[PDB]
Write a protein that binds this ligand. Structure first.
Ligand code: ZN
Length: 251
DNA sequence: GGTAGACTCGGAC
DNA sequence: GTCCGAGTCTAC
């Protein structure tokens, strides 16, 4: 799921788990657990804690318990569900949090690719994976000035810059390509080559693109006409990623 | 100390 | 058998 979908998960999951107390934690793929590194310690420490809140940072979910925070990343295909302990698990279920009321929070992923870290709440923001995370794209902390300062300091492409979690939190490949199209900027442009005007426009389109999604021109549209000018959309590799752009609209 | 490479995984190709 | 996404860790 991308950032907007993670926000939807945050908002929908919270009422389904708030105030429930963890009775057991069952782990079927220990490698998902990144901290404590021992999955048995991860399970043991969560037992007895009640779920108090659920926040989002970038694409991370932060489950707030009594003492601890569980920080979860679903990557491309991870999913959460709340269901009865009496019913069979869905395929590819890797971690289950069992509550005292006979319900469960289940994490599944066909790709078996996500991560979980647990720390004392007061520590979570200063440990991986949250440490160093950049500002929320929809926050005033993500400003044209912040974007410009990062851009002038790097030799990297503008796409690489936007994909950098330290620059802006959880702005995915799809929204990078869409935002750059809407701003009229080629993804392979050196970040330092952008004018103040281009930076301002880019920031504006990033906020609009992700704001609209929480409330496609190019992504996956290679070979099809641009919706704005009719030129075939192209796909190349930029910053190690599939990259979609209109070679007329973007400069 | 900025930046690229290694590392996870399995469905699609 | 290879490709590919995110984000952390490793190493230059
Ligand atoms: Zn176009």
């Amino acid at each position: 799921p991308e950032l907007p979908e993670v926000e939807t998960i945050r908002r929908t999951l919270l009422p389904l788990i708030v105030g429930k107390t963890i009775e057991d934690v069952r782990i079927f793929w220990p490698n998902i657990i990144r901290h404590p590194r021992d999955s048995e310690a991860f399970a043991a420490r969560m037992i007895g804690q009640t779920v108090r809140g659920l926040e989002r940072r970038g694409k991370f979910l932060k489950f707030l318990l009594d003492r601890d925070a569980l920080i979860s990343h679903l990557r491309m295909e991870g999913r959460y569900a709340v269901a009865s302990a009496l019913e069979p698990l869905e395929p590819h279920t890797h971690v289950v949090f069992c509550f005292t009321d006979g319900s469960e929070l289940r994490y599944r992923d066909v790709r078996k690719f996500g991560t979980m870290h647990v720390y004392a709440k007061e520590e979570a923001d200063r440990r991986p994976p949250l440490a160093e995370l950049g500002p929320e794209p929809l926050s005033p902390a993500f400003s044209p000035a912040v974007l410009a300062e990062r851009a002038v300091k790097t030799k990297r492409s503008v796409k690489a810059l936007l994909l950098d979690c330290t620059v802006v939190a959880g702005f995915g490949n799809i929204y990078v390509d869409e935002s750059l199209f809407r701003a009229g900027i080629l993804p392979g442009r050196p970040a330092a080559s952008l004018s103040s005007k281009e930076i301002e426009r880019l920031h504006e389109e990033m906020v609009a693109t992700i704001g609209e999604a929480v409330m496609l021109y190019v992504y996956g549209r290679q070979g099809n006409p641009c919706k704005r000018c009719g030129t075939p959309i192209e796909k190349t590799v930029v910053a190690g990623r599939g990259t979609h752009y209109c070679p007329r609209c973007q400069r």
